[PDB]
């Protein structure tokens, strides 16, 4: 079973930044897709950023495009979500996810078989 | 544990779970058995954790290929449909719910890739893959292209590669042979060779991914794409006059997309196996039962012959079922993770030119 442990969360002020991490353990070699999703208090879960692990292509929701960057350190088995220029509407519980194959846009959440714990990034004005 | 005299059903949050609960209300109205339909997060992996404890739902809905691991862990009860019921579903769908020769779930719905085409640019889409080069020449002269689809993902390139004889693992009599892999036979070579030749002759670009293809079709820039029913909603809003049809043949043989069969399995720990059997066979897998779910969230093509023949009035759904019947059931064994990684590397290496097609497919077969 592919496992993911989450970290990096925090509470900061607007204009600040944060970096989320998510450690992958197990049969993680054949993974093809890694994504970051968030769920605001009492709202839908939203794809934020996704990465095709092979040739490193990246996909971003319009809400964070140009502010967030998804990156994978292969040598360390860890996917990062760099969250620059944080806004108050970025406050949500953030999840990372993994999948071997994908029939859909990598930003759709039903695609992914494995999931993390969900940490509360909080950004205050 | 799991309490008796009622049914708990787990189904993913993207499905029509309120329509399913409406079927559960009818079951309760006839039998007094309460049916509660929930859609927990992380369902695919929460079920094995909660079922291996002896806990969990009585019924779980998921793509058939995951049930293989469930059955391997002894988490699913062998089901007992009689011949009359089995005859109500398309025969290939039953093949999708076999594990080590035993039936371990009821097929519900059927999904596969289809050929999606722009009726304005192309009122008569090609029947064969060999037609596309000349067709791309015509549309290049009009500022368009013939075909754009995701080349970065084997799921999308497999219909072509598998057309003339490729396959993941050989299926025989309800079992897969882990040692018989068909990614390196003459059929797979012929198919991937054509894919690479289309790229060499500048008819497709090797870096085309999901996003590029989807935007290229939905902006009227390409006459055709390859995608599944999950994609129709974005095309609807794009105001592109599109149709959905059978995939082109290659060497006269149908394209063989992977088939996913949404299926309902029964928890081995369920003390309500007979109640679940009755609900699934006599209420859900009926015209009225599938219609209730479909009116909530469309199921696409369905395994039930009678209701599919009604749904197939939509030619898009008819095309989905036709491509499914001509396709390859996605194997339900754990070694598929190796197949994905291997075929992905080979296609990218062959399409990139970093390796010939022969050399590419010899490496995919060896681990």
């Amino acid at each position: 079973q592919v496992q993911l442990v989450e970290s990096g969360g925090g509470s900061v002020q607007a204009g600040g930044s944060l970096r989320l991490s998510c450690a992958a353990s197990g049969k993680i070699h054949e993974i093809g897709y890694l994504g970051w999703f968030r769920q605001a208090p009492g709202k839908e879960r939203e794809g934020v950023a996704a990465l095709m692990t092979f040739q490193g292509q990246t996909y971003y929701a319009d809400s964070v495009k140009g502010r967030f960057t998804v990156s994978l350190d292969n040598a360390k088995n860890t996917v990062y979500l760099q969250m620059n220029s944080l806004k108050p509407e970025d406050t949500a519980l953030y999840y990372c996810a993994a999948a071997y194959w994908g029939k859909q846009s990598p930003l759709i959440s039903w695609d992914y078989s494995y999931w993390g714990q969900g940490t509360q990034v909080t950004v205050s004005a | 544990k799991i309490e008796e005299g009622k049914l708990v059903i787990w189904i993913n949050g993207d499905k029509g779970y309120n329509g399913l609960a409406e079927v559960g209300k009818k079951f309760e109205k006839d039998t007094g058995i309460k049916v509660t339909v929930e859609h927990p997060d992380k369902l695919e992996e929460k079920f094995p954790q909660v079922a291996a404890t002896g806990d969990g739902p009585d019924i779980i809905f998921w793509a058939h290929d995951r049930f293989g691991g469930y059955a391997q862990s002894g988490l699913l009860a062998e089901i007992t449909p009689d011949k009359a019921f089995q005859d109500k579903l398309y025969p290939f769908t039953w093949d999708a719910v076999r594990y080590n020769g035993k039936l371990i779930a009821y097929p519900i719905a059927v999904e596969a890739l289809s050929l999606i085409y722009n009726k304005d640019l192309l009122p008569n889409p090609p029947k064969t893959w060999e037609e596309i080069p000349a067709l791309d020449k015509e549309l290049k002269a009009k500022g368009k292209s013939a075909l754009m689809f995701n080349l970065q993902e084997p799921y999308f390139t497999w219909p072509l590669i598998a057309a003339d004889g490729g396959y993941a693992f050989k299926y025989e009599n309800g079992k897969y042979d882990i040692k018989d892999v068909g990614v390196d036979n003459a059929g797979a070579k012929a198919g991937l060779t054509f894919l690479v030749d289309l790229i060499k002759n500048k008819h497709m670009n090797a870096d085309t991914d999901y996003s590029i293809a989807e935007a290229a079709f939905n902006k009227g820039e390409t006459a055709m794409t390859i995608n599944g029913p999950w994609a129709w909603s974005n095309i609807d809003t794009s105001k592109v006059n599109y149709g959905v049809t059978v995939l082109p043949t290659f060497k006269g043989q149908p394209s063989k997309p992977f088939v996913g069969v949404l299926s309902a399995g029964i928890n081995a720990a369920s003390p309500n196996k007979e109640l679940a059997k009755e609900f699934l066979e006599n209420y859900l897998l009926t015209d009225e039962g599938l219609e209730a779910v479909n009116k909530d969230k469309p199921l696409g093509a369905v395994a039930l012959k009678s209701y599919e023949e009604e749904l197939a009035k939509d030619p898009r759904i008819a095309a989905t079922m036709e491509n499914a019947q001509k396709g390859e059931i996605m194997p339900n064994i754990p070694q598929m993770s190796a197949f994905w990684y291997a075929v992905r590397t080979a296609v990218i290496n062959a399409a990139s030119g970093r390796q010939t097609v022969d050399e590419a497919l010899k490496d995919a077969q060896t681990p």
Side-chain angles (χ1 to χ4, degrees), chain B residues 79-148:
Chain B
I79 62 166
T80 61
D82 61 14
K83 170 165 159 46
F85 183 86
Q86 297 192 46
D87 288 353
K88 291 186 186 177
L89 304 195
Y90 293 96
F92 76 93
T93 74
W94 290 114
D95 293 332
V97 292
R98 305 208 96 97
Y99 187 72
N100 242 63
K102 330 290 180 170
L103 293 181
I104 42 77
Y106 290 92
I108 304 297
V110 176
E111 184 178 70
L113 291 174
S114 294
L115 218 221
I116 306 184
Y117 70 104
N118 183 322
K119 297 186 180 181
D120 292 338
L121 300 173
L122 196 64
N124 312 114
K127 286 301 184 181
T128 195
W129 276 95
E130 295 86 341
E131 265 166 82
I132 294 170
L135 187 67
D136 185 66
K137 204 124 303 177
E138 290 185 12
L139 287 164
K140 250 55 186 289
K142 305 180 185 174
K144 308 295 185 182
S145 65
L147 171 65
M148 299 201 70

Side-chain angles (χ1 to χ4, degrees), chain B residues 185-226:
Chain B
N185 54 39
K189 291 186 277 226
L192 185 55
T193 297
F194 197 85
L195 184 52
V196 173
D197 276 341
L198 284 170
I199 288 169
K200 271 177 201 167
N201 295 338
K202 308 306 203 75
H203 300 299
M204 301 195 316
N205 281 339
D207 71 306
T208 302
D209 73 332
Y210 195 93
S211 315
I212 291 164
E214 185 177 35
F217 187 82
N218 296 20
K219 290 192 296 179
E221 301 174 347
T222 194
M224 291 177 288
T225 191
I226 295 184

